[PDB]
Amino acid sequence: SIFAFTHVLIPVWIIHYYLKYHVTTKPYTIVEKKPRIFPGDTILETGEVIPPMKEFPDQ
Amino acid sequence: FLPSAAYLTHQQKVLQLYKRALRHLESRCVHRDKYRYFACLLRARFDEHKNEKDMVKATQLLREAEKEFWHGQHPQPYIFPESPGGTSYERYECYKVPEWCLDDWHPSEKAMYPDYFAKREQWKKLRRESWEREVKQLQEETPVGGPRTEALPPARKQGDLPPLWWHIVTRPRERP
């Protein structure tokens, strides 16, 4: 119990302190390949639809 | 290239040929029963012309036997895992720390092991007491100016230990 306590709490705390403040105050740092968005979705942030695809036929 | 003699013998050379060919036939021939058949065939082939009273015909058959053996050997023979070239072959040479050491310890570690170091002290006194006169007299008494052999004589005079015994007795256990 004490092993899982120290090794999933203390390096997690040290790294997650390290990655917020120092790391994301350096500007060009951790960067993510963007989530793909699909024509039936709606954007969670602002809120607007994405137009669906047209008719299917000749399959 | 042997300690006791200079040349092997004729019979010793035929005998080494027989052991090497029988071992290579072991390695060649799995399932052990066709092996046993072929081994008795080889034993019969030696029996058919074992009783020839010549000597130059004996070395003739020996030489052609080495030819027809070295034709038919096996590339990777099953050598045991203690022989040279084998699978282990001093696997545990990692741990053969020799016993001229173990005297260069700190005396606290010598205070951890009292009885073994006391008995090593009495063995070392037995080495030092019986070294000079007995061993050196038996080594400088019986040989000629040329020794001409490597077998050394036992201690049979009256008492104590054989000559030159220390680094033959006190060798590591070979499975430490």
Partner: protein, 459 residues
């Protein structure tokens, strides 16, 4: 810089009027304090160099080499007992004072503003090393080694003085700034070619290159550990330092005239890495290793890329540390068994369990282990020389393969597999030898964390 010159003087009568069995502690303590004070130098910033007089000034090339000298002094002054601890008090004090005086002329030489002053303190560095290796060489050809050392290094180094006097009285003074800020191109005549050949050939003798390298291995296998480590590290890297400074003049003709030295250095780097693969005499392997790596340094200096100069100074400092340490392990094994050979002293994995770590770690810093400084230097030299020509990287990688081969053979020869079981005199490892190993390795790893120091002028 006078604050570094004068306590080096003051550390000399320390050794005389300290009493018996107290010269050692005082000299070691005070030279380590000098090492801290030396590390306080590292101020050098941006635009200019820093001037510690019209007499002394420091480029950022000279800073890590100067800290290397004042760091390698106490390490050596501890390294050089147990082969003179039984000798006399007066001869012991003379040896220690000789090392202090050699440090003094090395600081003189690394903070040399003027090239005339640089030449005088160059051969002033040359003077005490002959006395050291001849009086404590501990072999029978130490006379031959010291004499070849002397006449090679003079007879190469000597017309350099004539060329420097000619530059002195054709262009005014020889401060490095006024030699700089004024330097004009010198066209393809023949007198300019001989002036170039005089200066560059003097330092070619000092590095050495392949045609002049038998200078070195006698002066290492027939010398004590103090003269060996100072000789290798500080004298060869001082020669490289000098070539780096003097190559600012003679800009156009190096393209015309600098092809055969590149050639002799490359092919002799390959042949020297090949000759140190099959030899006995364990000390000599590190000597020819040093010849190979300084031939690589010479290729790096004579091509004139900023990548090449950064890789050159990194390779200088890393190889100085590695070769000095590996000399010291070789002397440790020689103090264990009075052999100097290689196929005799076998075993030593079973016995001496901790020494395997230092052998392995020094052999990997010689292997160009990738976060270490040695691979940083070799890698930038390979980048610059592949920019020089697209075909010469074969020789660099073949040097890399053979270097890994002989270094790791040197590891697995002496210290791998079976004690010869007739030795029975080797004692367990002292605290002194392992203290010396920890004083070698730990600055190299801590520079491997942050190597923005040791990259030179073109950072």
């Amino acid at each position: 810089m006078l604050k570094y010159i004068i306590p080096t003087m003051m550390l000399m009568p320390l050794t005389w009027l300290s009493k018996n069995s107290m010269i050692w502690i005082n000299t070691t303590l005070h030279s380590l304090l000098i090492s801290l004070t030396s590390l306080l130098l590292l101020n050098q910033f941006g635009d200019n160099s820093l001037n510690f007089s019209l007499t002394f000034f420091s480029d950022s090339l000279s800073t890590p080499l100067l800290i290397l000298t004042m760091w390698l002094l106490p390490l050596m002054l501890m390294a050089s007992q147990h082969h003179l601890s039984k000798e006399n008090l007066a001869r012991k004090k003379l040896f220690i004072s000789m090392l202090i005086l050699l440090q003094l002329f090395l600081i003189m030489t690394f903070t040399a503003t003027e090239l005339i002053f640089f030449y005088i303190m160059f051969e002033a560095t040359l003077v005490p090393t002959l006395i050291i290796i001849t009086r404590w060489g501990n072999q029978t050809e130490r006379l031959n080694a010291g004499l070849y050392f002397l006449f090679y290094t003079l007879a190469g180094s000597l017309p350099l003085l004539v060329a420097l006097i000619y530059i002195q009285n054709t262009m005014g003074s020889l401060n490095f700034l006024i030699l700089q800020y004024w330097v004009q191109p010198m066209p393809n005549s023949w007198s300019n070619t001989f002036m170039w050949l005089a200066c560059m050939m003097a330092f070619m003798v000092k590095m050495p290159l392949y045609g002049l390298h038998l200078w070195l291995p006698k002066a290492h296998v027939e010398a004590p550990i103090a003269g060996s480590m100072v000789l290798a590290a500080i004298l060869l890297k001082l020669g490289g330092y000098g070539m780096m400074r003097i190559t600012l003049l003679l800009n156009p003709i190096t393209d015309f005239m600098a092809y055969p030295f590149i050639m002799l250095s490359l092919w002799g780097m390959i042949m020297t890495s090949s000759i140190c693969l099959r030899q006995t005499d364990l000390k000599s392997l590190i000597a020819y290793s040093s010849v190979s790596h300084m031939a690589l340094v010479i290729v790096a200096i004579l091509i004139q890329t900023p990548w090449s100069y950064m890789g050159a100074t990194a390779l200088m400092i890393a190889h100085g540390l590695t070769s000095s340490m590996l000399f010291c392990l070789a002397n440790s094994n020689y103090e264990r068994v009075h052999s100097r050979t290689m196929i005799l002293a076998r075993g030593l994995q079973t016995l001496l369990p901790l020494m395997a770590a230092w052998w392995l770690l020094a052999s990997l810093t010689n292997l160009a282990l990738p976060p270490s400084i040695n691979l940083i230097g070799e890698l930038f030299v390979v980048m610059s020389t592949f920019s020089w020509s697209n075909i010469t990287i074969i020789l660099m990688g073949l040097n890399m393969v053979i270097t890994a081969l002989y270094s790791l053979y040197m590891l697995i020869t002496t210290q791998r597999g079976k004690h010869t079981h007739h030795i029975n005199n080797i004692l367990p490892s002292f605290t002194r030898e392992n203290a010396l190993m920890s004083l070698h390795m730990l600055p190299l790893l801590l520079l491997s964390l942050n190597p923005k120091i040791i990259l030179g002028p073109l950072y």
